[PDB]
Design a protein around this ligand. Structure first.
Ligand SMILES: OC[C@H]1O[C@@H](O)[C@H](O)[C@@H](O)[C@H]1O
Ligand SMILES: OC[C@H]1O[C@@H](O)[C@H](O)[C@@H](O)[C@H]1O
Ligand SMILES: [Ca+2]
Ligand SMILES: [Ca+2]
Ligand SMILES: [Ca+2]
Ligand SMILES: [Ca+2]
Ligand SMILES: [Cl-]
Lengths: 112, 111
């Protein structure tokens, strides 16, 4: 099964990726609501998910460039505000928000 | 318990910080079955969450609990040189005490 673990510190997505890969894992990418809730259980605050629309705007893929199916966007999201929001975080209510990849949040890693 | 190995080598302090970052700890085998599981996740020599930094020749886990199960390689522990207060799991599954300042892979443990 997949196991999820949350970081203690906040960091931008690239450092988040590096953290998870250090232990040979990836940044958590929920494929359904059960997994979304399992990530909620470990995330004590807003945290990064392994999803971005960095390739093509409004097309969300996991970190391996694989287009995602399941989404749980917060109302009004994704909205790509300002200079752009191409990363995704799981809010404390379990819904997602697109955010700048350079902003810092906790990170949930996934292993299997 | 779930065990994960790092890809890079680092001294024990950095090793502890890494596992703690994801709210886990440096792996401490409590029996032969756990020892094997950690050995398998580690592709090379890796630190275990055991030291005798507090009291020489008194090996305990990172929370100060004296370890019962041990799997020392023959001749170990030997505290050579100016001291070896950290512990690594060799590629043959046996343990060796080493300087905490030396770099090895790290296997983290999670519950
Ligand atoms: O900077 C704060 C903003 O962040 C955006 O990502 C979000 O869509 C907005 O609703 C607002 O929360
Ligand atoms: O530095 C090399 C030495 O490392 C020690 O920890 C070990 O006990 C010795 O047998 C030798 O391998
Ligand atoms: Ca975007
Ligand atoms: Ca947004
Ligand atoms: Ca010693
Ligand atoms: Ca030794
Ligand atoms: Cl030492």
């Amino acid at each position: 099964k997949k196991y999820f673990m949350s970081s203690v510190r906040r960091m931008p997505l690239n450092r988040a990726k590096a953290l998870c890969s250090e232990l040979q894992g990836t940044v958590a990418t929920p494929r359904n609501a059960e997994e979304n809730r399992a990530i909620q259980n470990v995330a004590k605050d807003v945290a990064f998910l392994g999803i971005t629309d960095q390739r093509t705007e409004n097309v969300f893929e996991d970190l391996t460039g694989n287009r995602v199916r399941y989404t749980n966007w917060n109302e009004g999201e994704p909205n790509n505000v300002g200079s752009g929001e191409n990363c995704v975080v799981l809010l404390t209510n379990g819904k997602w928000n697109d955010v700048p990849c350079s902003d810092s949040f906790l990170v949930v890693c996934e292993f299997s």
